[PDB]
């Protein structure tokens, strides 16, 4: 059912096109904050531990993790700070768990679009798709405080999520995406201004 689901996250691109090119801009712009930053290497350590730190906030998070992966090259790297993260969260506690997870999950999840797109307008598409199935992931996660927020137990619901996504009405996927235009452009104009003054 995902080719029904990007139908109609690509009548909610028509249908604003200025807000999700907007969007697709400041993808771009995030992936040369950290691109310019130095080496992937370079920044993958410094964008880490700044977030065990504490010093990373969850839109800086979010605007990390694309600019990490949106380079073939910087998605084994992208990868490999996945799992460190995930290795130094569970070895951590409070905002430096928490922190990290988020950056574990969001790092994969980007090289799982930027795998699954062949151009920047593919990868607009499916993620308004995977926006919809976060937000279902999320209330499983709210309903059940036994769901682990281990980095294994939100992907499972993110993939439980995404089943749900890809099956939803035209409507629901359409506001999810009318949505996801406006949460990411505060959500990246934050993270790339944090990111900016972090990473130079
Ligand atoms: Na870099």
């Not at 801009?25 to 930053?37: D, P, Q, R, S």
């Not at 993260?85 to 928490?98: D, I, L, N, T, W």
């Not at 920047?120 to 209330?139: R, S």
């Amino acid at each position: 059912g995902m080719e029904k689901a990007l139908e109609a996250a690509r009548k909610a691109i028509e249908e604003h096109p200025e807000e999700a090119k907007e969007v697709a801009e400041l993808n771009k712009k995030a992936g040369e904050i950290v691109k310019e930053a130095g080496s992937y290497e370079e920044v993958a350590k410094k964008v880490l531990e700044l977030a065990r730190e504490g010093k990373l906030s969850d839109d800086a998070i979010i605007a990390a993790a694309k600019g990490l992966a949106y380079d073939e090259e910087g998605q084994e790297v992208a990868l490999k700070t996945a799992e460190e993260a995930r290795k130094a969260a569970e070895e951590s506690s409070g905002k430096g768990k928490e922190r990290l997870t988020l950056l574990s999950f969001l790092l994969r999840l980007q090289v799982r679009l930027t795998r699954e797109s062949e151009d920047d307008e593919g990868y607009l598409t499916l993620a308004t798709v995977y926006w919809l199935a976060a937000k279902i992931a999320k209330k499983k996660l709210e309903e059940d405080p036994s769901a682990s927020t281990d980095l294994e137990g939100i992907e499972k619901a993110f993939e439980e999520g995404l089943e749900e996504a890809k099956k939803a009405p035209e409507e629901e996927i359409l506001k999810a995406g009318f949505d996801y235009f406006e949460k990411a452009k505060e959500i990246m104009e934050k993270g790339n201004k944090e990111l900016r003054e972090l990473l130079f």
